[PDB]
Amino acid sequence: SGAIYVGNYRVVNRHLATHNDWANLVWEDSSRDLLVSSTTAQGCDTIARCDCQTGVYYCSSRRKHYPVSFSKPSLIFVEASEYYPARYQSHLMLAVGHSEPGDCGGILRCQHGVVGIVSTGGNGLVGFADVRDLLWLDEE
Ligand SMILES: CSc1ccccc1CC(=O)N1CCc2nc[nH]c(=O)c2C1
Numbered sequence: 001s002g003a004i005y006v007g008n009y010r011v012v013n014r015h016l017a018t019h020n021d022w023a024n025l026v027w028e029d030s031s032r033d034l035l036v037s038s039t040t041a042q043g044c045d046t047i048a049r050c051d052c053q054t055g056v057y058y059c060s061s062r063r064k065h066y067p068v069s070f071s072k073p074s075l076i077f078v079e080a081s082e083y084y085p086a087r088y089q090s091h092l093m094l095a096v097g098h099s100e101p102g103d104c105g106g107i108l109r110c111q112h113g114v115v116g117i118v119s120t121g122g123n124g125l126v127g128f129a130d131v132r133d134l135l136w137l138d139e140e
């Protein structure tokens with residue numbers, strides 16, 4: 001579990017969104033595993049606006065933050081999980097690292113701010129849903 005809290009937005013994995021998220025929906029995209037809902041309180045996270053390929057992510061199944069090198073956001077085939085069939089997920093970045101299903105939502109960050117959230121795992125890889133192209137998170 002986990003979310004990004006930027007401005008009056010809450011960014012979560014679409015597959016972990018609650019009824020309150022769907023009832024206060026701003027935007028969702030199944031191909032990216034992302035959903036954004038509106039918040040009453042302002043958040044403290046800042047979004048990175050960059051092409052970094054090194055950063056640090058939080059792994060809840062180890063209570064640890066790990067430094068990683070990660071690929072550029074791409075269209076990647078992901079095997080079937082409890083939430084999606086085997087399919088192509090877009091705007092996904094891969095790194096070598098530990099990730100169990102419940103690790104989804106953990107933040108990946110670089111020197112500029114939040115880069116994305118854990119979305120996929122298995123085979124000793126971790127995948128992150130990028131948010132750096134969502135410029136509108138910084139306004140309204
Ligand atoms: C944090 S997500 C996670 C973590 C550990 C295990 C499973 C998940 C869900 C997930 O994304 N799967 C299902 C398992 C799987 N196995 C091999 N290759 C893959 O591409 C996948 C994709």
Ligand SMILES: [Zn+2]
Binds near residue numbers: 050052112
């Ligand atoms: Zn960066």
